[PDB]
Copies of this chain bind each other. A is one copy, B any other.
Amino acid sequence: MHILVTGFAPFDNQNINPSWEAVTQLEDIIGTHTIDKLKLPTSFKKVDNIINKTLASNHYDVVLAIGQAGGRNAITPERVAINIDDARIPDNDDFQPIDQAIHLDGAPAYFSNLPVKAMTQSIINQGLPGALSNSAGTFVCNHTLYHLGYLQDKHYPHLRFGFIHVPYIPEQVIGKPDTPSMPLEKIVAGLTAAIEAISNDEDLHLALGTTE
């Protein structure tokens, strides 16, 4: 399987983004998966066009987008994206969409069609903190996952797509009391395990739901 793996540019006054840092360190072949890496701007207006053009110029079986989830304490594949942008802060283009539909002709939500539970458990099997997240937020990451789901619905029926959020890396939490982080090497190991678990087979129906 030929996989496009993306990471995001630094944003919110950070000079580094763990998603891209981790992606840079991935092996170029992980098992039978061949990996192409792409750095996306943290930009609501630019991301969809970059994805569109990239899929138009190259054949990918899978698009797996990685992002920073500052404050999370686990590596978390995402189950679902929702059809709204609601930016707490502006993006890197100083654009702050609030309560805006992403695609008016799209579904209210799209579920990832990667084996998200297999990927989550693969992280856990390596002894790393992993969990299946049920919200990708309402910033550029959710927007990207949503757009991938919209493309699979409307234009690319066989495309497999998903998103994995990762914690801050340690250097990012100076001056942020009680904020979790995870060493970059661990993030890379977890992402590697998740990618290894990617296939066209049915997901694992493990007890990985979130129960309050």
Interface residues, chain A, with chain B CB atoms under 8 Å away: 12, 67-72, 79-80, 82-89, 96, 98-99, 107-111, 133-139, 141, 165, 203, 205-212
Per assembly, the copies of the chain total 2
Collect the chain B residues with CB atoms within 8 Å of residue A135's CB.
Answer: 133-135, 210
> Quick check: B80 and A208 within 8 Å, CB to CB?
no
Contact of A109 with B82 in the complex, beta carbons under 8 Å:
yes
Say which residue of B71, B83, B87, B205 sits within 8 Å of A209 (CB atoms): B87
A205 touches B98 (CB 8 A): yes
Q: Which residues of B contact A84 (CB under 8 A)?
A: 79, 111
Task: Provide 15 A-B residue pairs closer than 8 Å at the C-beta atoms, listed in order of the A residue.
Answer: A12-B211, A68-B212, A70-B211, A84-B111, A86-B209, A88-B210, A96-B207, A98-B207, A99-B203, A107-B109, A108-B110, A135-B135, A137-B209, A137-B210, A138-B211
When chains A and B are docked, how far (Å) is the Cα of A207 from the Cα of B96?
9
Q: Contact between A210 and B108 (Cβ–Cβ < 8 Å)?
A: no
Name the B residues within 8 Å of A134 (CB-CB): 82, 135, 137-138
A165 and B99 form a contact (CB under 8 A): no
Besides A71-B212, A84-B111, 18 other A-B contacts (C-beta < 8 A): A70-B212, A80-B108, A82-B134, A86-B208, A87-B209, A88-B207, A88-B208, A88-B210, A89-B207, A96-B207, A98-B205, A98-B206, A99-B203, A108-B108, A133-B135, A136-B212, A137-B212, A141-B212
